Each structure stands twice: as C-alpha cells, then as structure tokens.
C-alpha cells in the first residue's frame, strides 16, 4: 500500500519490514520480596539501625498498602464485583488491575500463612513450602550483602563499623528504592509496572527474580525489554516488611495482518538545497490501513516490533495519501547539518543523494552524476554493480522497481520546520495571514 | 468552572481533584561530602592509585570551584552586592543562587576551619565539632567500602589485589560521579540541583545524607520526589577533595485558590469511529482562571500535586472555552489502537464507550446499549445499580449531574492528529490552502 518507489525518490528508503507483536496471555507467578534483611547472625551489635530502617520503610510502604487496601476493601466475590462508590474515581486500567489484585488475594493469603517463615529467611533467595505442594520464593533485599560482607567480618572490624556499614547498606537500598516505591508509586494497583522496576525492592536484580520464578525462554528478553513482564504488588506487610508481587509472564502474539514498515531517512536534493522528508520512520499497516505507531514505547527487534500494548496512533489524511504516492503531500525539511544520512541500502540497491555525497562507480571508474533536477539516485546493477559512496565500497543488486527510476521526476512536497519553537512561529504566521484574509 | 458533564460526554471523565503545593521556606543545612576515602588503615600497599584518583578528581572538581569562585570573588556585603560587570552574564536564578552561595560562605569558612579533621575522617559518616556548639557532618565516599571490604582483607588477598580493588572502587565512584559533577555541572551556583544528584558524591546514598542532617518527616518523601530538597555546592576543596553542600529543606505550601483537576481520558464514539479528545489530563485552576500545568516536572500524589516551582503554563482561548462547555472547540483524535481506556469511574458513576466496550447490566441481566449518536454512556444507579463492562463487575452510585445525560446530545469538536510528523504535515496543508486562498 506504501508507494516505496516514490517514497525512496524523496528519501524514504524502504527499511526492514517488521511484524507486530503485543504481549498477551500473562502467566502469573507470585514472589515474596522481603525488603528487610535478617540480621540475626549479627544482632549482637546492630544498634538502633534496624529500628530506624523499619520506621523509614514503613513510611515508604504505608501509602502502597493503603492504595492496595482501597481496592482490597471494596472488592468481593459475587464473579468479582467492585464497589464503585467506595472506589469513587478510577480508570479502566486501574479497575481491571484491582480485579487482578483481588484474584491474587487467595495466593497472597496462602503465602501470608508463612509470615513467620518469611521473617526467618536468612538467605537472599529462599524457597518456602506453602501447602506441601505449592512453593513460594522469598527475595530478601541486602541479605546477600549481610551474609557475604558483614557476618564474616564481625570481629575483623569493630562492631560499630558493622553497624555503620549495615546502616549505609540499608540507606543505599532505600535511596535506590525511593525512585520506584516512593511517592512516584501512586498507583500500585496497576499491573503495568515492569518487573525491572519491581526488582528495586530486591536491589534491581530482576535476573535473580525471574530465573527463580522460572519462565519460558522463548522471547524472554524481548518481553523484558518491551516492558511486557510486569509486576503488581499484591500484598504489603508493615510488620515483617515484605511485599508479595504477582509477576505477569505473557507470551508474544503476532497481530493479524499487521506489519511495521521502517523507512530509512535519506536526504535528497531539490533546487540547490539538501532536504529530508518529514515522514514517520516506522509505518504501521494493519488490515490494509496505514497508521502511525508510538514505537518509542516498543522494543524494535530485527524481525519484529514488540510492544506491551497496541501503540497504533492515527495518521493524517495528507500523510496517508503521500505515503501511498502523492509525494507532493509529504513534508520535507531543510538539511543544514553535515551529519545526515546521504544514502541507504534497500534490497541491495543504493538510494543516494549523489549531489551531496561523492558517488563513484568502482567497476568502470566513473562518477555517478546526479542532475540538479534529481532528488536521489538509485544505484543498482544496471548502472553500477559496485559503487563507491564516499569511501565505502558496496557491491549492489538489481532494482526490482522501475527501470526508468532515475529518469522519472517526482512531485516535491512543501518545506517545513519541525522545531517546537519553529512550529509555534509557523502557527503564529498562519494565524496572522488567516486574520489578514 | 470546568463543565464536567460536557467534558465527560466527550470522554474527559472527572478524576481526582488535587491541591497545588510548591516548595517554600527552605531550611538550610550544610554537610561535608569528602569525595576521597581515608586509606590510612591500608596505606601500606596502596601504590599510586590514590595519586591518580586525586588527579582525576581534581580535574573534575576544578571547573566547579572556578564557577563558584566567579561569584565568591564578585560578591560583597554592603545587604549583599554583586559586581555585575565581573559576573558579566547571568540569569536571575543564577544571581539569587550566588546570593545564597555568599550567605553560605560564613558557615563554609567555619567548616573549613576543620580541614584537618575532615581529612582524618576514617568513617563514612563522622560528626565534627565546628565551634563546640555547632556540628558538621562529613560523608566520606567509599570509606564504607574501604573499612568493610579492603581493610579486613589486607592479608587475605595480596596487597596488589587490595590496590586493584581500591582503584576499581574509586573508578566506579568517578564513573557514577561524572554524570552529575562532570561537565554537565556547568552551573554549580544554582541551588536547583536535587539532593539525590548531590548524593552521587556520596555514592547516591541521599538517605544517609538526609537522615544524618535531620529533617521534618512531614511531606519529606513528597519533597524528595518533587525535586524540592535541593543541594547547592558551597565550597570545593582541591587539596582535601571534599565539597560543602548546603541542603535546602523546604516546606510545602498550598497555593491559594488553586486546585489541579485530573480528567480521566476515555474514548467515545462519533459517526462509527472511536475518538479520544485532545484535552490536558491535568487542569490547573487558580483564582478562577484556567491554565495548563507542566505536571511532568511535579510529583502527583493522591491528594496533591507537589512541585518545586509554579509550573502553570498558559492555555489557549479555545481550550479554555471548551473545558467550560463549548465542547465543539475541544479537539478529538481518532482511536486506532486497541488499548485505549473505554471507560472510567467518577464519583461511583461509570462513563463508558459502550459501543466499543461490551456493557452488560449485572442486576437485570440486560445489555446497556449505546446508540450511534451517543458519545459515551453514563451508567449509574437509576439505570444499573451494578454494571459489567467486559469482565469487570462494578456496583455504582447516583449521578449527581443531569438526569437526561444519556438523552442530551453534545456538539462535537474537530478531529486532529497529535503526532509530531502529523503536526508538521497539517501545518503544511494549512499553509498551502492559505496560500491558495
């Protein structure tokens, strides 16, 4: 549906076509992250460090537990009904997240039946027997540091030094914690917070968390970096200072009839100036409909664009029309920077601004000349099996498109200035001339 | 002043109303961060690691000390005078920050009278007696690591291993340092740099810094995450390699007659398409004047929006007029993504795009039908005490607004495309049609 020939003529060189994947079908695993280390092996000279740490951690965790209890006290089985009056104000995502929190409350209670065992956990990773057939895992923050650094050195340093080191470790853990579990966490109910953010409760070590829970190795890293492996805090304990996090392990599902077309931006020549067209570099085509996509929220991979949700966004009529051939409607922007892509390789074919980049033919030793009325030059086997563009030498292939590509002129779009302040000034000028008319 | 009924009819569901808080009245505390550890307990085989570290740290700190001395040498008391000619070029914020730096120079000199005691600080946190009634605290970077890891293991590993570990620790500290105290820090005079950034001089452990200085626990976390607890480097020592930072502990003041109204965005139907209105999700109303707010710079809390400054920004006439009822002036954007909020809960009342989300009435077992001429459906007690929207079951309340809400049609705004490239293309098209006219 995209007129790739005309797009390449205005510098939109056809890039890698990627399939569109969105997280689906989350496998739910509940893990315990005990935010307080077990200092029983060094309690002899702990001092008041643990009490102050408990006070600070309770102050941090109390808003989270209150926001959770907002939904835990207004949700009950019918079939799961939610007290909208008691909730009062909520978004759809937050309401479904409250439903998910309620469904996780059964396993949360089963885990909380092991509160004493969670407290006695003296290793950074411990498996606890929930009901002799289900097991829960406790991730104790800083327990590794305690057991590996402080306990082995009780008598090597004075116990006051051990106390100070413990206080410093706890405060560093809190400092790393506060960006995630602090006042920024105003909606702990939502199960959209990534497991990487959740792992700050374990010191940012989400690798240990995920390998301990277990996962499908298929697309695991892709699900991680697409922010698809999310965690939801299910239970907050203000006495044992641990959280229960339900970690959502989704799979990747290919969106039907959806591919994301990357366009490689290449500067071109018009008049005697260098231009790059202002066209999205990632085009989502779904069910033969062209739309934008907020691909910054997604993980771009060599074969697929992997998102945690549908990030399709609408496309204006002019951009859809010019991506389909009406290139006079694709906007272009002046190139005043020396670092702009002068060429790109597409299907073994070079599309180059040979006016701005030195195009030389490595086989016949001749210079590939671009006239002033040409935007790009398509360089392929028919003209130059091997081409030198600057200092890089590229052996080319056959252009599957038109054979009169370099002789067929294209209609050029209108110049634009995509700077924010330039956008405001252009709005000013348009409003002024509109009022004049 | 906001027409919440009409706004909800075009998907702007009334969210949580928040009070507007801005930092004020900073309590100033001066702390010493010794950016070099005391290796006297392990100096036997330290090698040239500390000399190289001193060279690198001096290179890092010299621009900061020079930038400070630009004001310290051009600021005099009569009442505090600055030589504007000697300063030459400065912003208002930087000038007031230079005033703050000058007022902190007295305590800076009082602390620097303890230069020898600062150099002998062999613990990560040490309290020093300034004048037998004032105390200053020294935060020695990596001293905790030295005392906890390297000193206890002098003979366990070869001292060359201790030297290499010390060098690695110092280099890791410098690597974390350079993002904050490096060339990015071109305005150390400004007291707008957060204490979290300042704490990189202590390894990012601002929890230890703030607990050591002491603070009002009221709104402390909210002041941290709003970037209100800022630090100003007051003194840089290039011989003992320590900085004096004045930490500003402000309080929170509620802005008069100011509330920030959150609007929950919900897709609606017009014609046979989904639409979401392009209206700010956070409306600042102050003294009965409607304006935008750059709330990304603020910390949104369940009850208040907490900022380090007034982030109110002007609102265009059309947005103000349509937020007050003229919904034909609120722009809308086509919804092409499958992940859009189809409904929201406001005051126990559901506002749902029942055409796009399946609305079923849990009490009477009937389907809540939305006609094609209806944008949303207000679902409340009068029609459905309990409603099922998809799979989530919500018990509702009474809509305090109109009783003919679902029968009163609204005037619809113009479609837009808020993509940056779409914005540029729309500017192109408007300019073209304007020139044609």
């Amino acid at each position: 549906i995209l007129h790739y020939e005309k797009l390449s003529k205005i510098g939109l060189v056809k890039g890698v076509t990627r399939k569109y994947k969105i997280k689906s079908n989350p496998l739910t695993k509940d893990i315990v992250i005990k935010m307080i280390p077990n200092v029983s092996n060094m309690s002899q000279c702990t001092g008041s460090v643990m009490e102050n740490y408990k006070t600070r951690l309770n102050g941090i965790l109390t808003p989270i537990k209150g926001a959770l209890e907002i939904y835990k006290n207004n949700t009950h089985d019918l079939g799961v009904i939610m007290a909208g009056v008691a909730i009062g104000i909520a978004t759809a995502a937050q309401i479904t997240a409250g439903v998910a929190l309620y469904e996780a409350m059964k396993n949360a209670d089963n885990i909380n039946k092991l509160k004493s065992s969670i407290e006695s956990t003296n290793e950074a990773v411990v498996k606890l027997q929930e009901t002799a057939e289900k097991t829960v895992y406790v991730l104790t923050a800083l327990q590794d540091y305690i057991n590996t650094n402080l306990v082995p050195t009780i008598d090597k340093i004075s116990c006051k030094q051990t106390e100070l080191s413990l206080d410093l470790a706890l405060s560093k853990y809190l400092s790393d914690l506060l960006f995630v579990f602090g006042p920024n966490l105003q909606d702990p109910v939502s199960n959209s917070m990534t497991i990487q953010a959740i792992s700050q409760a374990f010191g940012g070590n989400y690798e240990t968390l995920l390998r301990t829970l277990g996962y499908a190795t298929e697309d695991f890293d892709d699900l991680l970096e697409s922010d698809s492996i999310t965690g939801q805090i299910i239970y907050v304990d203000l006495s044992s200072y641990y959280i229960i996090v339900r970690v959502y392990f989704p799979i990747l599902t290919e969106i039907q009839q959806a591919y994301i077309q990357e366009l490689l931006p290449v500067s071109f020549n018009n008049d005697n100036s260098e231009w790059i067209s202002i066209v999205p570099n990632f085009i989502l085509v779904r069910n033969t409909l062209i739309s934008n996509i907020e691909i910054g929220f997604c993980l771009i991979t060599k074969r697929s664009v992997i998102c945690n949700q549908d990030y399709a966004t609408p496309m204006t009529n002019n951009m859809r029309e010019c991506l389909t051939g009406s290139t006079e409607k694709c906007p272009r922007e002046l190139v005043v920077s020396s670092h702009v892509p002068r060429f790109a390789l597409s299907n073994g074919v070079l599309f180059a601004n040979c006016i701005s980049v030195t195009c030389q033919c490595q086989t016949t030793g001749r210079a590939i000349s671009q006239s002033g009325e040409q935007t790009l030059l398509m360089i392929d086997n028919t003209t130059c099996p091997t081409a030198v563009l600057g200092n890089v030498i590229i052996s080319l292939g056959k252009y599957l498109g038109s054979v009169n590509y370099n002789s067929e002129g294209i209609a050029i779009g209108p110049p634009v200035f995509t700077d924010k302040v330039d956008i405001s000034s252009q709005i000013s000028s348009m409003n002024q001339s509109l009022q004049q008319s | 002043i906001l027409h919440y009924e009409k706004l909800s009819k075009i998907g702007l569901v009334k969210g949580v109303t928040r009070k507007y808080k801005i930092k004020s009245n900073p309590l100033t505390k001066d702390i010493v961060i010794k950016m070099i550890p005391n290796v006297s307990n392990m100096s036997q085989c330290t090698g040239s690691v500390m000399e190289n570290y001193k060279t690198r740290l001096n290179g890092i700190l010299t621009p900061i000390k020079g930038a400070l001395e630009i004001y310290k040498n051009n600021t005099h008391d009569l009442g505090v005078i600055m030589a504007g000619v000697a300063i030459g070029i400065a912003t208002a914020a930087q000038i007031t920050a230079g005033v703050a730096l000058y007022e902190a120079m007295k305590n800076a000199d009082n602390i620097n009278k303890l230069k020898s005691s600062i150099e002998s600080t062999n613990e990560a946190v040490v309290k020093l007696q300034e004048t037998a009634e004032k105390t200053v605290y020294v935060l020695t970077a990596l001293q905790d690591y030295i005392n906890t890891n390297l000193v206890p293991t002098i003979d366990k590993i070869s001292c060359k291993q201790t030297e290499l570990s010390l060098d690695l620790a110092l280099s890791k500290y410098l690597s974390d340092l350079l993002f904050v105290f490096g060339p990015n820090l071109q305005d150390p005079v400004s007291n707008s740099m957060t204490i979290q950034a300042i704490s990189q001089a202590f390894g990012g452990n601002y929890e230890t810094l703030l607990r050591t200085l002491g603070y009002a626990t009221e709104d402390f976390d909210d002041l941290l995450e709003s970037d209100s607890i800022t630090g100003q480097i007051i003194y840089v020592d290039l011989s003992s390699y320590y900085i004096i930072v004045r930490v500003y502990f402000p309080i929170l003041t509620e802005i008069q007659q100011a509330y920030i109204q959150e609007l929950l965005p919900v897709s609606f139907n017009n014609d046979n398409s989904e639409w979401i209105s392009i209206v700010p999700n956070f409306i600042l109303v102050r003294n009965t004047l409607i304006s935008n707010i750059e709330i990304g710079f603020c910390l949104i809390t369940k009850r208040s929006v907490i900022c380090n400054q007034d982030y109110a920004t002007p609102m265009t006439n059309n947005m103000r007029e349509c937020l007050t009822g003229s919904t034909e002036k609120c722009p809308r954007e086509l919804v092409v993504s499958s992940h859009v909020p189809r409904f929201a809960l406001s005051n126990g009342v559901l506002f749902a795009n029942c055409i796009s989300v399946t609305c079923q009435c849990q009490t009477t077992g009937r389907a809540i039908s939305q006609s094609g001429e209806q944008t949303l459906l207000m679902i409340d007690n009068t029609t459905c005490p309990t409603a099922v929207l998809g799979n989530v079951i919500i018990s509702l309340g009474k809509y305090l607004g109109s009783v003919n809400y679902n029968s009163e049609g609204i005037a619809i705004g113009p479609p837009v495309f808020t993509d940056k490239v779409d914005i540029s293309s729309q500017i192109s098209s408007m300019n073209q049609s304007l020139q044609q006219s």
Epitope: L213, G214, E218, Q256, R286 | -
Partner: antibody, heavy 116, light 105 residues
Framework: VQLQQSGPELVKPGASMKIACKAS????????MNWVKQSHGKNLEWIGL????????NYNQKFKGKATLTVDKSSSTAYMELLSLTFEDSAVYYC??????????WGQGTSVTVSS | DIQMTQSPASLSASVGETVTITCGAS??????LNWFQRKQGKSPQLLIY???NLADGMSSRFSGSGSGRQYSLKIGSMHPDDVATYYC?????????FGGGTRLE
C-alpha cells in the same frame, strides 16, 4: 458461558474450510480463544490462540500456514480457517476460552473428516 | 516444544481408592501445568490449572501436585463419574503441548 462450534463437516482433500466458534455468556473481546486438534480420539495438541482484544495470534509451529485464526467481534465468533487439508487434518477441533493460561470453557468440538 | 509425558497411559483401579496420575515434562515448566478431564465423546474440561489450583465447578477429590518437570494428579476416592481421559498441558512455553493422556477406568 457457551462456545458454539459450527458442526462436523465433510471436506474434500486440498480444500479449505472454516470452523465457527460463536461465544456467549461472557465478554468475547476480553478472553483469548485457543484451538486444539484431537486426533485418533486420544492425542490432543494445541493449534494456536487468538487474542480478540488485540488482534494477536500465537500459533503452534506445526499449524503455521495450515491453520489461520480469525475473530468476529461483532458476532463474538472466532474462526479457524484450515488450509491445504490432508488426511491427517481429519481430527476433532476445539475452541477453548482462555483468560490467560487455563482453557476453562470449550466448544463441543468439530469432528472434521477429509475425504472424497 | 516441551515433551509432556504421562507414565500411566492406561490405569484401572477399584472405586474408592487413591489414584495418582503422574505427568512429566522434558523441560522444567515451573508449575505452568494444566490438567484436563476429557470424558468419552465430550470436550476436555479444565481440571487443575497451575498444577495445584482446582478449577471451579470441579470435585474436591482432585488434588494434583508437583513442581519442576515431574507432576502428579491425585484422585483420592474414585467415583464412576471420573472415568475419563486426563491430559496434563504444558503452559509455560508458547507451543502449549499436551501429555499423552491417562485413560482411567
């Protein structure tokens, strides 16, 4: 909560046929439907799932190309178009509702036979 | 694919005595194992999901356990009704495979 299959069909080899799976009693869009192939009355094997909410599909490698899953959100119906039918494609085909990972509600199944 | 194996392919025991239906997995599936009951001529019914959780509407005598790659479905006291075929389904990795099947008579 019901899943209505299209019904047993007699289809010629090399042809293409479509299983209909009407849904009722629940939110069709908010549940994923899986498809499984019951061959020889004993062996079960998962064909693929379709997420009607997002339009996404996840196929078994064995069934890529042979089976394509579509949905009809207007009719709350999910389809399984079977391509290039052979004798091995003669089996019992189920549509199973899936919240995320547990096929709790199944269609009655379509015993599809491939012959002339 | 994860090969999902059931040891007692065909088992017949007296009514009212404990029955353990063991299932195995080629790879560790971390409790992402579903159990399905397929009576003769009828669609498989979700029996136990998550390798421990009893599915709603199912009898309390189904007490399936297990962790890692080796699992087990327990019947306890039989009844003539649960004479069916039991399938343990892999759920961890995307090609959600099934076990061979246990026909209990």
């Amino acid at each position: 909560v019901q899943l209505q299959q299209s019904g047993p069909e007699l289809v010629k080899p090399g042809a293409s046929m479509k299983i209909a799976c009407k849904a009722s009693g629940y939110s069709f869009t908010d549940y994923t439907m899986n498809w499984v192939k019951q061959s020889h009355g004993k062996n079960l094997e998962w064909i693929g799932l379709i997420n009607p909410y997002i339009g996404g599909t996840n196929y078994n490698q064995k069934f890529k190309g042979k089976a394509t899953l579509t949905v009809d959100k207007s009719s709350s119906t999910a389809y399984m178009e079977l391509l290039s039918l052979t004798f091995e494609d003669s089996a019992v085909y189920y549509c199973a509702r899936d919240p995320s990972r547990a096929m709790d509600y199944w269609g009655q199944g379509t015993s599809v036979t491939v012959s002339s | 694919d994860i090969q999902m194996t059931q040891s007692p392919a065909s088992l017949s025991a007296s009514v009212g005595e404990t029955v353990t239906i063991t299932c195995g997995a080629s790879e560790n599936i971390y409790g992402a194992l579903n159990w399905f009951q397929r009576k003769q001529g009828k669609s498989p019914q979700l029996l136990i999901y998550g390798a421990t959780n009893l599915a709603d509407g199912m009898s309390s005598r189904f007490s399936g356990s297990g962790s890692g790659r080796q699992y087990s479905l327990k019947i306890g006291s039989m009844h003539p009704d649960d004479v069916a075929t039991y399938y343990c389904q892999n759920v961890l990795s995307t090609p959600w495979t099934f076990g061979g099947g246990t026909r209990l008579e």
